[PDB]
Write a protein that holds these residues in place. Structure first.
Motif, PDB file in Angstrom:
ATOM      1  N   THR A  49     -61.075  24.470 -14.371  1.00  0.00           N
ATOM      2  CA  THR A  49     -61.434  23.821 -15.651  1.00  0.00           C
ATOM      3  C   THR A  49     -62.676  24.349 -16.352  1.00  0.00           C
ATOM      4  N   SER A  50     -63.667  24.869 -15.641  1.00  0.00           N
ATOM      5  CA  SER A  50     -64.875  25.270 -16.348  1.00  0.00           C
ATOM      6  C   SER A  50     -65.753  26.278 -15.646  1.00  0.00           C
ATOM      7  N   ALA A  51     -66.573  26.971 -16.423  1.00  0.00           N
ATOM      8  CA  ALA A  51     -67.550  27.849 -15.825  1.00  0.00           C
ATOM      9  C   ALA A  51     -68.650  27.029 -15.201  1.00  0.00           C
ATOM     10  N   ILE A  52     -69.085  27.470 -14.045  1.00  0.00           N
ATOM     11  CA  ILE A  52     -70.160  26.840 -13.323  1.00  0.00           C
ATOM     12  C   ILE A  52     -71.463  27.592 -13.475  1.00  0.00           C
ATOM     13  N   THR A  53     -72.525  26.876 -13.828  1.00  0.00           N
ATOM     14  CA  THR A  53     -73.855  27.476 -13.981  1.00  0.00           C
ATOM     15  C   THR A  53     -74.853  26.859 -13.024  1.00  0.00           C
TER      16      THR A  53
END
Ligand SMILES: *[C@@H]1O[C@H](CO)[C@@H](O[C@@H]2O[C@H](CO)[C@@H](O[C@@H]3O[C@H](CO[C@H]4O[C@H](CO)[C@@H](O)[C@H](O)[C@@H]4O)[C@@H](O)[C@H](O[C@H]4O[C@H](CO)[C@@H](O)[C@H](O)[C@@H]4O)[C@@H]3O)[C@H](O)[C@H]2NC(C)=O)[C@H](O)[C@H]1NC(C)=O
Ligand SMILES: *[C@@H]1O[C@H](CO)[C@@H](O[C@@H]2O[C@H](CO)[C@@H](O[C@@H]3O[C@H](CO[C@H]4O[C@H](CO)[C@@H](O)[C@H](O)[C@@H]4O)[C@@H](O)[C@H](O[C@H]4O[C@H](CO)[C@@H](O)[C@H](O)[C@@H]4O)[C@@H]3O)[C@H](O)[C@H]2NC(C)=O)[C@H](O)[C@H]1NC(C)=O
Ligand SMILES: *[C@@H]1O[C@H](CO)[C@@H](O[C@@H]2O[C@H](CO)[C@@H](O[C@@H]3O[C@H](CO[C@H]4O[C@H](CO)[C@@H](O)[C@H](O)[C@@H]4O)[C@@H](O)[C@H](O[C@H]4O[C@H](CO)[C@@H](O)[C@H](O)[C@@H]4O)[C@@H]3O)[C@H](O)[C@H]2NC(C)=O)[C@H](O)[C@H]1NC(C)=O
Ligand SMILES: *[C@@H]1O[C@H](CO)[C@@H](O[C@@H]2O[C@H](CO)[C@@H](O)[C@H](O)[C@H]2NC(C)=O)[C@H](O)[C@H]1NC(C)=O
Ligand SMILES: *[C@@H]1O[C@H](CO)[C@@H](O[C@@H]2O[C@H](CO)[C@@H](O)[C@H](O)[C@H]2NC(C)=O)[C@H](O)[C@H]1NC(C)=O
Ligand SMILES: *[C@@H]1O[C@H](CO)[C@@H](O[C@@H]2O[C@H](CO)[C@@H](O)[C@H](O)[C@H]2NC(C)=O)[C@H](O)[C@H]1NC(C)=O
Ligand SMILES: *[C@@H]1O[C@H](CO)[C@@H](O)[C@H](O)[C@H]1NC(C)=O
Lengths: 145, 442, 145, 442, 145, 442
Positions: F148-152
């Motif tokens: 679902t999303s990029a992780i930072t």
């Protein structure tokens, strides 16, 4: 007649709409901003799209600077509180040798501005000097009372 | 003996260029032009005002072709990049129920694309239009943009459909509108009103025919910067309109794959039914009458003992030689030779124009960027109006009288120049002087 | 003498250049912007480099705010239409006990401003109160007519 | 009995710091400083005005070292990243016609870099300077920046060549310029004019010698924050000038590879002719006279029965111990020990200074970024002027009189501080009061 | 009483604090900016965080526009140099039929503003027209001298 | 006969919304709210002023929940992305000294991550909490955010610890503060002062209990938009306070790896001592007295012959069903069923609440982003105050009198709404008219 409805009218007739155009710059600035501030996703666009947002700030700052420029000139000439002001500088036939009855009856402001366009800077300089001399004279008259 | 009198609130104008703002009644135009329009548009007719307009120097056109670019770039910014799909493709021909013309038009390409995890790839099969795929040297291919620019997928739910756009003067400025029905784009106009916002303009982008614009009030109008100079375009505005029906007859089963972490890629996938050519339909009779009207108006500038010939484009890139059109989000490149093949001298029977489809678009002619137009599920049909033409006089000092015109165009500013011709931006400078008989007390 | 050409002149002499400095802030703002607006790729730099663009807006908004600050003070004191204004507040020997003939003949404005720098805030407060009282008195005189 | 009188338009100043704007007569400076300069520069001499200037507190220096940084970062932003080339390199020595000194200076490295497609790599051979490549442990190597920062290639067509820069006051501010030829950077100046814009300054960046600056009008001037404090630098401005000839004698065949989708990488490729050391040439006689002038002026602050010795840098990083210089876009690190090896007491014969070349630069001393300077095709020669020196007094309370100075410097602000010393920013506050004999009517 | 300390006081009493509120907009703008300009990493935040920076420019430009709006209205009505101004427009019993002794003694400005809120636009239009007529009359009187 | 008189400087108000600025006495709040607070806060008491306040329409809340979001996004922007670590993980259970409850809570995962060079990978072993890792289908796993999303990764030295925040009106605006101790959030307030800046507010983020807020001056206050509507939350402000002790008992040896070119990744690494469950400790007696006070105040709105029951959350995502809390930078999800399991009718003995730990947080409920909270070395303990509760009336038209309340909440605005309730933003419009006996001379 409405805003600029007097543009083709004679210079004389146009004097009765001076309040219409004079008030238009700031009421214009404010009404446009009041609609922008309704924020139908405008506050979000205005601040998120920083490129667009600075174009709008640039337009508004410039509109304000022009308002102030003209108000300051009227201030320097002793004309700031009025739309119509007389001064202590005589008219030069070298600027225009047209009859007074033509100027205020057979011609519009657009035409007139073109007719004397090249004398704008000199007239303004004369007005500034005359006003400063007059203010000094008044100060001295008070000292002498 | 006359004296100087200062007046403020004076109705005096100077020509100017300013940063006009947009207003309008998941669309990008609607998002950008968030500012509402007047609920009751008003204009002030100016009696006894004559002003010169110059369509060819209209800075409103230049601003429109600066903000439209920005809007597309911002709209495509928060979207999935398809750079992971600039890979070697293994392609064969689509041979499933192919009509003629379409043979070799579509290719069935497969490739290994990235997935949610960096350790896994997915084999994908997708059909592509020939124009988007080039051979590297069945055979190995790459996407056309792989050696010049990054490719970005346009977001599938974002609508770029044109909606009416109104340009509005910022306070301190006003817009002068020309009401002269005979106005040819340059020179004095004697029926002028002042408005705050312009007539809505639809930001339609096309290359040879001008679609969904305004119509001329009384007659076809030929507007140009010059008549003699064959390096200039002629913008022809029609009074009546020609309906054009554009269809992509193929059915589509659009599929999606995650390319990355919440990043989806859309691809054509397969095709349902026969593989057929896209077409644009123009009624022949309507077109011949329309063209005849244009010819008579051209005679007024070239002579009425002349021969007026039409011909197709001389050559060059697809984006110029064909008529580019955005249909439902799909990108069409229509062959107009069937419309301009004629010479004029002193059941329905439609004209069918074949049309190509291209998914990778070098939009707005910037060499460093390209967008991928995702495919649309199902069959696509658009009905639109031809409101004008962009013609190029071929030129040549032959003195044969056989003037020849071509559907050249290809510029992007011309499309709005033809709509904004009625407007001029003027700065108001309400301060000035005049002589009177009044001297101030001192 | 030109802008600030009077800076080393005496306070008396300097009164004749008040129009030169007074008009300089807005004519300055406007002329600089008129050159920026020639757009030799400046409009593009101004709007594309948003960091630089806001530094410029910040400078212009601040220049305008200072102009208005001073104009409002003059407004409150009943001095807005003039470069030279007398008031109804007596001079305090505690601010300066220097002779009037020294102030207007043997000293410059820069020197004077330093001499009375610490009394600026009190003088301004006195001017504001005196003017408000005077305006009320005039209103009452009209009521009594 | 005196009365308060209010005056507006009063010529009164306060010290201030503001966001000065740039103006100037594919260069970055030209692009940024888009605003034109006065076609007719003017200054107003101020009679009977004495003001204090303080070079060491000049906020114009601080603004210059804020905008120059921004300009470099913006200029390098829309460029190709070379992160795909932080790979293990396979390196051997360059043994082709090597003169002494240069043995082991260049290495022939090969690597597998990315290409237009993600499925293909290209073997590349390129020569590198030793300073850019470090051993990992013939042998495996990595680029020096691989364990600390992303590397970005500077765009090959962008010119960073300094051009004259003029700083201009925004309206409401003015700049006071000191005309006193004897001014030492601190204290009262009695010959002051008001200007709108400064003298053009060239934004030259260097570390030990100050190049292409202004010259002192009458004599060499020693300017410092303090004399006693050996933690402070001495900025020495020369009245005459010393010409220095900098050359990189090697010929180059620069080649390029696509690293990615429209992204080009430039590399040294091979070298034509012998492999030779870069050098900087200073005439010995000119240098000895120049240094002697500096020595006499130093005696004025330290005593004239003293011994003045010069020595080279005490140590530290290359960027400080050597004289950094930008020549045609190439980055030079010159060894100045040949200039400062001397003691003074109460055909042409040039001095040749060897110089190293480095392609990966930690420019402006930011640990998190580095730029790659692409190589320049052909032979590079620059001729420039030494207009000043940055000296560090070594110090030590020995009372031996043997003052020792070194070409330390290494700061980046000093280079402009020495040029902007004549200017101060002043805010105009034209409102004030004074007593008169006039009372307003009430 | 301090800024707005008169808000609950009667309309009459409140006339003595007109200078307190009137001066507050620009002295407010300037003092807030003077603190921001101390730059305890604010100049850096203001210019680096361009989103935040334009929110601040937006607030300041708007505050200035409102100041100018009101000053221009006073200018048009011939009231710009004063905090208290009489005009040549009679009061309408249709706007308010309250006794004068109630208005200036038993009621506050907040209450009054609500009482006549719907007549603000008409009163302002009447003031603008009356002032323009008066200025023309003065110009003609000078012509006749 | 009365005449119009114009007054400027008139003390008249209109309700308004504006962009309030922040001020405060390597923390993000300190960096953002750079503007200093008044060294001497002042308020002007307004005698005879009655104004209506409306907590539920307070636009100060909406601005606070716009700037807090921005601050987190800017703070996490210049940080290392962990997208290179969305790889297939090879995971086994942690079986080293495991107490019950914790069995299966931690997994020992290994993976191949990138390193300084693109040609090398590093095998890494790290422990993860079960909530962050999901099975793909010992076994192969992926991080929860991979589809679902990029992780930072949040930067390890950046402090997000709340500090007092003061909101300040921009010039032209003022803030009205309500001093009425009995004020329930809606309606007229008769003890109002004007301030420039608000009381400092701590930007604490939590979901069921409100931590580190203000206390009610005299009694527990039940504040709500409505009583009847069970779709609305009840914000309960306590007069006294309940201390809660939150601890993560496990010791940690945090290690780091370069993921890329100057980019560091932090990982849990191993655990020292026994593997134990995190807990939150609330004194039972204090809690029972506190709850009893809340019950009596609820009786005032529902009847005092009623039965008031408390129950735990009805279900849904962890972020709502549990009490979210930020402890030292670690993210806690505490099970509050032990606090709300009770019915009221007409040594220390603490309550121990088990708590889960989660490193990947979908902070602020944005589906497209996630942050990685780096682990903290050592044992973590926080002591904080429960200053309020968010209750949801369960509802149901049973007329049984058994009103039931649950610790629902889950909104993020409620946490500040309960603190900013005393403030309103008012625009000052100092221009108006009134009749007088004075006519201007004409
Ligand atoms: C000149 O002007 C014409 C007229 O506007 C343009 O032709 C129109 O183009 C639009 C955009 O493609 C068409 O709108 C789309 O219609 C699709 C078909 O739906 C039909 O049935 C509904 C039932 O209510 C009708 O409302 C509709 O008009 C159709 O008859 C829809 O499926 C589309 O919806 C999808 O796209 C929109 C894009 O904004 C999304 O918001 C939706 O979520 C969805 O994804 C869409 O509504 C319109 O029908 C066309 N009109 C005609 C004549 O058929 C020409 O394109 C224009 N010329 C140029 C140069 O483009
Ligand atoms: C102190 O000041 C001196 C003098 O300016 C600097 O030395 C100059 O440096 C510049 C920049 O490298 C040189 O300009 C370059 O010259 C190259 C050689 O061309 C010769 O022939 C042409 C013929 O007309 C002459 O005009 C030119 O002066 C040379 O004699 C050119 O090839 C370069 O062009 C390339 O670079 C420019 C960069 O902007 C690009 O725009 C071009 O497209 C192209 O890529 C360029 O013109 C200049 O010649 C040098 N002068 C001297 C003395 O020779 C010193 O560098 C400076 N000190 C410091 C610290 O740098
Ligand atoms: C409600 O309010 C309470 C009280 O503020 C909060 O609990 C505090 O939380 C902070 C943040 O974690 C704690 O501050 C940290 O304390 C750690 C322990 O150090 C102890 O010893 C020093 C010795 O001087 C004391 O000063 C300190 O108070 C402790 O007793 C430190 O190791 C931490 O330093 C690290 O984090 C900071 C974060 O800014 C970094 O700047 C440092 O460089 C370093 O990395 C830090 O100082 C504080 O101790 C807690 N107080 C209590 C009661 O113990 C609650 O968290 C809050 N409620 C909520 C919802 O959070
Ligand atoms: C535009 O010009 C016409 C004349 O060409 C103006 O007409 C005059 O209107 C007044 C008022 O109704 C009459 O008394 C005059 O007799 C008309 N003039 C003529 C020659 O008949 C008209 O007013 C002008 N418009 C504007 C806005 O000024
Ligand atoms: C600077 O100071 C000198 C005096 O030191 C001023 O000189 C006077 O100039 C006037 C006009 O020419 C003469 O009448 C006086 O006699 C001069 N003074 C003396 C002592 O000789 C000069 O005017 C000042 N400059 C400015 C700009 O004010
Ligand atoms: C608030 O209202 C009270 C009355 O309710 C005002 O009190 C008056 O104060 C004056 C001055 O001290 C006295 O002479 C009056 O006799 C008081 N009135 C009464 C009824 O006793 C008070 O001044 C008002 N506050 C403000 C700021 O206006
Ligand atoms: C498709 O067929 C044509 C011949 O009609 C041939 O030139 C082309 O290379 C074929 N394409 C593929 C992918 O096989």
């Amino acid at each position: 007649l409405g805003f600029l409805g007097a543009a083709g009218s004679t210079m004389g007739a146009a004097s009765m709409t001076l309040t219409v155009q004079a008030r238009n710059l700031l009421s214009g600035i404010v009404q446009q901003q009041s609609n922008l501030l309704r924020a139908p996703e405008c506050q979000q666009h205005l601040l998120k799209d920083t490129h667009w947002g600075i174009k709008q700030l640039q337009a508004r700052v410039l509109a304000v600077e022009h308002y102030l420029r003209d108000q300051q000139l009227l201030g320097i000439w002793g004309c700031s509180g009025k739309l119509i002001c007389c001064t202590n500088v005589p008219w030069n036939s070298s600027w225009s040798n047209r009859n007074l009855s033509e100027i205020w009856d057979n011609m519009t402001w657009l035409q007139w501005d073109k007719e004397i366009s090249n004398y704008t800077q000199i007239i303004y300089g004369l007005l500034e000097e005359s006003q400063n001399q007059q203010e000094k004279n008044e100060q001295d008259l008070l000292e002498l009372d | 003996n006359l004296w100087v009198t200062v007046y403020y609130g004076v109705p005096v104008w100077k020509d100017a260029e300013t940063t006009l703002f947009c207003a309008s009644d998941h669309n990008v135009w609607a998002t950008h032009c968030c500012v509402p329009t007047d609920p009751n548009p008003q204009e002030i007719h100016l009696e006894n005002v004559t002003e010169e307009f110059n369509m060819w120097k209209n800075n409103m056109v230049e601003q429109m072709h600066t903000d439209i670019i920005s809007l597309w770039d911002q709209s495509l910014k928060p979207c999935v990049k398809l750079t992971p799909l600039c890979v070697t493709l293994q392609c064969t021909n689509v041979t499933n129920n192919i009509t003629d013309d379409m043979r070799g038009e579509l290719k069935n390409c497969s490739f290994n694309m990235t997935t949610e995890l960096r350790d896994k790839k997915q084999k994908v099969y997708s059909l592509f239009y020939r124009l988007d795929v080039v051979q590297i040297n069945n055979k190995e291919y790459r996407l056309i943009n792989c050696n010049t620019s990054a490719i970005t997928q346009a977001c599938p739910k974002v609508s770029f459909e044109p909606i009416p756009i109104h340009y509005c003067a910022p306070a301190g400025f006003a817009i002068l509108k020309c009401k002269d029905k005979k106005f040819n784009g340059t020179g004095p106009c004697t029926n002028v009103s002042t408005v705050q916002c312009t007539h809505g303009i639809k930001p339609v982008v096309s290359t040879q025919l001008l679609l969904n614009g305004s119509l001329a009030e009384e007659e076809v109008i030929i507007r140009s910067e010059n008549i003699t100079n064959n390096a200039k375009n002629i913008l022809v505005q029609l009074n009546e309109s020609v309906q054009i029906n554009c269809t992509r007859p193929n059915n589509n089963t659009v599929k999606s794959i995650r390319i990355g972490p919440g990043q989806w890629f859309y691809y054509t996938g397969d095709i349902i039914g026969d593989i057929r050519q896209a077409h644009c339909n123009v009624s022949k009779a309507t077109w011949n009458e329309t063209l005849g009207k244009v010819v008579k108006q051209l005679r007024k500038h070239f002579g009425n003992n002349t021969i007026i010939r039409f011909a197709n484009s001389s050559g060059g890139d697809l984006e110029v030689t064909t008529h580019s059109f955005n249909c439902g989000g799909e990108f069409f490149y229509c062959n107009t030779s069937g419309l301009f093949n004629s010479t004029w001298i002193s059941s329905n029977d439609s004209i069918t124009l074949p049309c190509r489809i291209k998914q990778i678009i070098n939009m707005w002619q910037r060499i460093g960027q390209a967008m991928y137009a995702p495919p649309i599920q199902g069959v696509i049909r658009c009905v639109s109006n031809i409101t004008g033409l962009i013609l190029t006089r071929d030129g040549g000092s032959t003195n044969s009288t056989t003037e020849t015109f071509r559907p050249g165009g290809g510029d992007m500013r011309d499309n709005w120049r033809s709509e904004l011709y009625k407007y001029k931006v003027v700065k108001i400078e309400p301060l000035g002087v005049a002589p009177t008989r009044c001297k101030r007390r001192v």
